[PDB]
Enzyme design. Structure first.
Site, PDB file in Angstrom:
ATOM      1  N   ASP A 159       9.939   9.859  -0.028  1.00  0.00           N
ATOM      2  CA  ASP A 159       8.692   9.217  -0.450  1.00  0.00           C
ATOM      3  C   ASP A 159       7.850   9.935  -1.531  1.00  0.00           C
ATOM      4  O   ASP A 159       6.991  10.791  -1.243  1.00  0.00           O
ATOM      5  CB  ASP A 159       7.860   8.830   0.804  1.00  0.00           C
TER       6      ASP A 159
ATOM      7  N   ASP B 295       5.654   5.132  -6.453  1.00  0.00           N
ATOM      8  CA  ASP B 295       5.944   5.278  -5.044  1.00  0.00           C
ATOM      9  C   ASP B 295       7.252   4.661  -4.605  1.00  0.00           C
ATOM     10  O   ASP B 295       7.359   3.448  -4.569  1.00  0.00           O
ATOM     11  CB  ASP B 295       4.729   4.707  -4.258  1.00  0.00           C
TER      12      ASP B 295
HETATM   13  O1  LIG Z   1      -0.228   5.711   1.745  1.00  0.00           O
HETATM   14  C1  LIG Z   1       0.618   6.419   1.206  1.00  0.00           C
HETATM   15  N1  LIG Z   1       0.305   7.515   0.439  1.00  0.00           N
HETATM   16  C2  LIG Z   1      -1.053   8.003   0.114  1.00  0.00           C
HETATM   17  C3  LIG Z   1      -1.465   7.764  -1.376  1.00  0.00           C
HETATM   18  C4  LIG Z   1      -1.153   6.305  -1.747  1.00  0.00           C
HETATM   19  C5  LIG Z   1       0.106   5.979  -2.281  1.00  0.00           C
HETATM   20  C6  LIG Z   1       0.378   4.631  -2.575  1.00  0.00           C
HETATM   21  C7  LIG Z   1      -0.571   3.628  -2.327  1.00  0.00           C
HETATM   22  C8  LIG Z   1      -1.850   3.958  -1.839  1.00  0.00           C
HETATM   23  C9  LIG Z   1      -2.136   5.290  -1.532  1.00  0.00           C
HETATM   24  O2  LIG Z   1      -3.421   5.592  -1.057  1.00  0.00           O
HETATM   25  C10 LIG Z   1      -3.884   6.882  -1.351  1.00  0.00           C
HETATM   26  C11 LIG Z   1      -5.268   7.071  -1.489  1.00  0.00           C
HETATM   27  C12 LIG Z   1      -5.750   8.356  -1.801  1.00  0.00           C
HETATM   28  C13 LIG Z   1      -4.866   9.447  -1.953  1.00  0.00           C
HETATM   29  C14 LIG Z   1      -3.479   9.263  -1.824  1.00  0.00           C
HETATM   30  C15 LIG Z   1      -2.982   7.982  -1.515  1.00  0.00           C
HETATM   31  C16 LIG Z   1       2.088   6.083   1.404  1.00  0.00           C
HETATM   32  C17 LIG Z   1       2.311   4.892   2.383  1.00  0.00           C
HETATM   33  C18 LIG Z   1       3.799   4.439   2.520  1.00  0.00           C
HETATM   34  C19 LIG Z   1       4.444   4.156   1.133  1.00  0.00           C
HETATM   35  N2  LIG Z   1       4.209   5.308   0.243  1.00  0.00           N
HETATM   36  C20 LIG Z   1       2.790   5.713   0.069  1.00  0.00           C
END
Ligand SMILES: O=C(NCC1c2ccccc2Oc2ccccc21)[C@H]1CCCNC1
Ligand SMILES: *[C@@H]1O[C@H](CO)[C@@H](O)[C@H](O)[C@H]1NC(C)=O
Length: 335
Positions: free
Chosen positions: A221, A38
């Site tokens: 992102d 990420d």
């Molecule tokens: O929350 C985000 N993306 C969602 C994606 C995710 C990516 C990174 C961390 C946690 C997270 O939670 C989940 C849970 C289930 C499915 C997909 C995700 C973003 C937030 C800002 C920084 N990049 C990731």
């Protein structure tokens, strides 16, 4: 003797065109984890063996099986868009591709069922800058640059379209894979260092520039599944597409999907165009069926936001290179 000619690649797994994850190894001997890489965050974290609900569904890190583990214990809280995680700091050897780095990461003990039971990955590797890192913890790429072993201080992303024994995606550390892009890269510099965010000079629907005429921000992102804008912008855009607001997403009649107009993003004096095939989840062609769009609304709070975010929807179309040395992002059409 660290001669800079390394270009270590990580094969990614495509889950529903929403989750792209690769494998990392933590400890001596290495304990493997499915991680999301990420660019929107800068902390590394995996679930802990010390975890007391979504933990049951994931691989856990056991410090007591690693001979290279060094205790720290500092409590840590990491907040994302769907949910928050909690744990403590620990240090160990992390293996990514063929690179071995001594990294400070978070062993997570509080991991909510929503959204984490929907996650097909165990943890997260933040590819952002130290400026965004919680508890000022050195990010993994910063630590790889320190080793002085890469061809170049860059990393690139390839996200494929769900197929079958095909490649789901690929991160290259140290370069770009020419097998995965057409032509040459176009570079856009970051507004400021510390965030993988660039200036955008407009969003078009068809051939008419509908939004962001006076300029706006765009966050690149890799951790986002969709393209997102402010509620205001997404309301205007969806009204133009004639999409209706459902509870968690926007839909159109499945028959209307192939005839939807092109959406264009103006980045660094070039238009980056997404056709209907790129943003509609074409699950059916029936008039009786409703089809989801790979675009949603999300209000990003300051300092980062208000901003748009170009996630997997954008990245699938455009192979992306993130240049640390030069503080710029490069797009070439994916192949
Ligand atoms: O929350 C985000 N993306 C969602 C994606 C995710 C990516 C990174 C961390 C946690 C997270 O939670 C989940 C849970 C289930 C499915 C997909 C995700 C973003 C937030 C800002 C920084 N990049 C990731
Ligand atoms: C934990 O790591 C931080 C660095 O982020 C360090 O300053 C601190 O002293 C460490 N604490 C312990 C208990 O080792």
């Amino acid at each position: 003797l660290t001669l800079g000619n390394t270009t270590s690649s990580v094969i990614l797994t495509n889950y529903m065109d929403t989750q792209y994850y690769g494998e990392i190894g933590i400890g001596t001997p290495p304990q493997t984890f499915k991680v999301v890489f990420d660019t929107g965050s800068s902390n590394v974290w995996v679930p802990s063996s010390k975890c007391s609900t979504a933990c049951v569904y994931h691989k856990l890190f056991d410090a007591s099986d690693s001979s290279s583990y060094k205790h720290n214990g500092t409590e840590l809280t990491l907040r994302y868009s769907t949910g928050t995680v909690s744990g403590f700091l620990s240090q160990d050897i992390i293996t990514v591709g063929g690179i071995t780095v001594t990294q400070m990461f978070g062993e997570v003990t509080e991991m909510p069922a929503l959204p984490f039971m929907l996650a097909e990955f165990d943890g997260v590797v933040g590819m952002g800058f130290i400026e965004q890192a919680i508890g000022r913890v050195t990010p993994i790429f910063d630590n790889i640059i320190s080793q002085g072993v890469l061809k170049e201080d860059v990393f690139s992303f390839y996200y494929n379209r769900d197929s079958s024994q095909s490649l789901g995606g690929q991160i290259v550390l140290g370069g770009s894979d020419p097998q995965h892009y057409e032509g040459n890269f176009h570079y856009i510099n970051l507004i400021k260092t510390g965030v993988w965010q660039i200036q955008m000079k407009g969003v078009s629907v068809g051939s008419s520039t509908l939004l962001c005429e006076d300029g706006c921000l765009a966050l690149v992102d890799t951790g986002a599944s969709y393209i997102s804008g402010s509620t205001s912008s997404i309301e205007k855009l969806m009204e133009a597409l004639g999409a209706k607001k459902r509870l968690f997403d926007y839909v159109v009649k499945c028959n209307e999907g192939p005839t939807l107009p092109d959406i264009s993003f103006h980045l660094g004096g070039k238009e980056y165009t997404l056709t209907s095939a790129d943003y509609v989840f074409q699950e059916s062609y029936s008039s009786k069926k409703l089809c989801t769009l790979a675009i949603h609304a999300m209000d990003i709070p300051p300092p980062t936001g208000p901003t748009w975010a170009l996630g997997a929807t954008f990245i699938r179309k455009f192979y992306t290179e993130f240049d640390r040395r030069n503080n710029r992002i490069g797009f070439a059409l994916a192949r």
